[PDB]
Symmetry: C4
Subunit: 326 residues, 4 copies
């Protein structure tokens, strides 16, 4: 009963239940050649959603993404391209959600992307130094300028998202259509409890990220930090610490148990985790990440796992994780 394509929240924007992101990989960990192959595989498999950000690889991720789109020549109208704005430089005025950086940042992202507009522009995170009204007016402005079709939030609290809606309705501006939130077996609270309320109240959709907790859910770290793994990359010592932390090892213990259900269902752990992220209608789309073609094809195969996630299967997983939100 799964519908591969669904509306992003209550907006009219239709997206595939699975998207492909560019964090770490594009313009960084992987070659442009591998990136091209990954996007082609995604696109050919129905995926129309591709996420990026001005900060990814200091802007190179957007460059690679734009190059592929141009080289492949896919119709712009058949793609949903999203980017996020917060950190776009070292200068004081090159970061934040001020009108100045919103406009300068998106303009610079579009130039790198070789695109006239993105379908959704996201505030990559909350800005405690900029009043909501200024931010909402700036997002509304770029949409009115044809630089984006819609806008959204990322890593914002339920209250801050409602605040953006409040400002939009008071000054007759455009409200946000989606919140890009982290969601995986070890981070469920926000997406399972809070976001559903925002959907029914103000139509906000949930586009989730890091469905494998940066690859931790794959269980490839059951025995240390494998070579070439994200956790072994430069600038990702923070990930390695989380993996080697006390809590990071307790997660591995639970994973081994989840692995049992995986093989018992005839799928891999990553496929179980990803399918798990889509088990509820509440999630509009799960943004995937992959360093090679084997991972992506495996991940996409998660769709076939959905039908096997019965009530019993879900309860067993909850008993194992032991973190089912109230």
């Amino acid at each position: 009963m799964l519908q591969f394509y669904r509306n992003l929240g209550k907006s009219g924007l239709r997206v595939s239940c699975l998207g492909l992101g560019t964090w770490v990989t594009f313009g960084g960990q992987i070659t442009d050649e591998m990136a091209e192959h990954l996007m082609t595989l995604a696109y050919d498999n129905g995926i129309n959603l591709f996420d990026t950000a001005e900060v990814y690889a200091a802007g190179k991720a957007e460059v690679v993404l734009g190059n592929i789109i141009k080289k492949k020549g896919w119709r712009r109208s058949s793609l949903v391209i999203t980017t996020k704005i917060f950190a776009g430089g070292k200068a004081e005025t090159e970061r934040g959600l001020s009108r100045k950086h919103i406009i300068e940042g998106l303009k610079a992202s579009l130039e790198r992307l070789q695109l006239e507009y993105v379908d959704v522009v996201f505030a990559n995170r909350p800005d405690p130094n900029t009043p909501m009204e200024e931010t909402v007016r700036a997002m509304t402005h770029v949409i009115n300028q044809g630089m984006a079709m819609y806008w959204g939030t990322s890593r914002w609290s339920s209250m801050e998202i409602m605040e953006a809606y409040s400002v939009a309705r008071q000054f007759n501006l455009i409200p946000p259509i989606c919140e890009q939130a982290e969601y995986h077996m070890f981070q469920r609270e926000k997406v399972e409890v809070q976001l559903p309320e925002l959907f029914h109240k103000i139509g906000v959709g949930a586009m989730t990220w890091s469905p494998l907790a940066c690859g931790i859910v794959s269980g490839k770290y059951d025995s240390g930090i494998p070579p070439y793994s994200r956790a072994s990359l430069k600038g990702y010592q923070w990930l390695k610490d989380k993996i080697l932390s006390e809590e990071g090892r307790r997660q591995q213990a639970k994973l081994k148990e989840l692995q049992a259900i995986a093989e018992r269902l005839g799928c891999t752990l990553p496929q179980l985790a990803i399918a798990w992220c889509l088990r509820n209608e509440g999630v509009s789309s799960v943004l995937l990440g992959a360093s090679n073609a084997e991972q992506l094809m495996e991940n996409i195969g998660a769709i076939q796992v959905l039908p096997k996630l019965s009530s019993s299967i879900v309860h067993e997983i909850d008993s194992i994780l032991g973190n089912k939100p109230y």
Copy 2:
């Protein structure tokens, strides 16, 4: 007492009581040469309204229409060009009334038409997957961008049209000026009963289509499906089935009777049917269709029939049709 030119609803847009459409014919059933001749004949006879759609002939109808306008060099200010948006591609995001497709779709139609803007952009049909607010904001945006002068609805229910007005007045956006509805002797309810209410309440005008029920009213199918007829064209098996259906034959029976009044008045059946469509002020303009010059000139001659449609004549027709709405 007929006024050849009238306002489209309560808007200031003045249109001829007869327009020329491009469905099936332009870029499809007829040659560009024949299309040029038909439009010239229309224009030279006072017709200033020409309708098309992104979906007609996969966009070719708009191409032919734009070519003629350019080749003939008529002043853009002397023309009322309308197009409709819903289905503009095979991709998921290439259909619907989302802001994304509204903007991408109209932009693509304008490029094909070689025009900077259309006078009216229509939503070709209702979109159950896009909230009215998003659609109304998108229509308002393209009007503000100078891509269209006004917007309208097509195949929308009275309630959905009122809903668009509601959103427009609540968020101070631009309301629709017209609804493009089917109207002929075998489809009267909506146009005769509901649309008049929308005109007096929210100024919505009625621009009607298929005045001959795709040619069925001409009675050329009194004996099967004549060669080259629309019903015998590829992709129009649906029309042939309606003609050969039980109800389709009962219509022919009534037509034969209507034919009596036609010849009794000194006009053809198509002229009687078309003049009938304009008998009431409620209809701002009737969109004509034609595959050759004989049909168009005949159709235009319907204007001369109007004066003969007395109360008695109208009552006789009602008795024959037996479908006068309450």
Copy 3:
């Protein structure tokens, strides 16, 4: 105590108490060479206001005006250029105050004028076929598009002007700043009684036209229709009839009497009439007309007459005219 420059109504637009119009003369009755000289004389004498219209000489007036501006190279910021829109073609959709013609009409005027925008765009007259809301939205749109700085009305009733303000305040649009009304010794009611109310209520300014009643006030028709006079021009038989009419001769009788006061003051009749038009603060600016340099220099000399228009002088004129409004 006269201030040569004053605000046009309550707006911030500052105009000279005297402007130079282009009706009949520019691109028509006079040569481009004479037009250039007249504008230069005006500009050099402090006049910054120049009025035209899409209908004047079928658009040639705007062409000549734009040529002079370009040839002389005066700073655009030192000029106040106004044009009026209603009749811009023979086609049905080429006339009126519909959004379509407002945009097409002004765009075409600007191209002829070789200007990016006019300071004020006027609706040349009321349009009974277009709802006020559509007209006000269209004027607001062109101002927002940078095609005009402000907009105004011409030949509108006090109630229709208040209606435009009503729509502007209800839908948060831009209200009109001025009404271009006829004003001379034989047409005082509207300007003296009604316009002052609009100024204090909604800040509307009064820019008056035909201060010499098309030249009739000069008294050059005291003995028929002199050669080369406007009344003897082709297409102005209507003016000749008004002059030769019973009322037209009764005006001449009164003029002869006014002539007495003129010579008694040391000025010409035209100078007395023009100075009379500016005697009250209510009039922001009087638009002058002239076929040669002698008339213009004479007319401009009306400024020196103002100081002599005492209460007694004004009362004597009222006794003669006998048309002082209540």
Copy 4:
């Protein structure tokens, strides 16, 4: 506890506590070479705020400023460029806060600056001939046109600033973010008493100017008008009169006393005065002025003085000045 960078009022625009202005110097008193050096020194020292005006050196200040920015090639996103509009020509319509001059004036400033937009456009002073609504709509328009990111006021009373906010909230326009006010030891009332109220009430920020009272606070006029001093420049006889005035000499007397505290703290008088201007959070940024590199480097050194401005030090200064506002 000083934060070099702070928000300009409640807006999201982040500026350095010290800015560099161009009045008198750029394109005038100093060479383009010296101007380039001064800006480079400022920029390299963290200063991101540079102020100018259409009136400075008849537009040359903006030309020099734009040349430096272009020659140095600093990222536009790392700069906060502000300009002020009021007097942009000799013609009547070339001055004021009318929509006409706002648009023409800023457009001309941007061309001279070789920039697409300024971060903040200021009304250089109040305009008693233009209604607030017109001015606020014009500022909102240029911001919506991408010609400026924000707008502000300069030399406006607290009530006039609140009036601009009132109009903005009534017609849903954009309110001002900052007021550029004079602030130095001999002008404290407005900035110390009134502006703080506007900050808490409507978020208006305080960007101050002439922190050395045009150089008077430096005490270089303790013995007349030194050569090359601003007071000895052409067109600045007004400054010399203020210095040589009775009150101007009484200020010198107080300065000599302040000098005691300066040397007693280990800093110069200008450093004490400038640091004094930043002692309170109320001031977002102090705009500096300098004719040579020695002055600028000295002035910037005022930051190190801030830590020494204890309560006692501030009280001693108040006792000396004897002008502490109520």
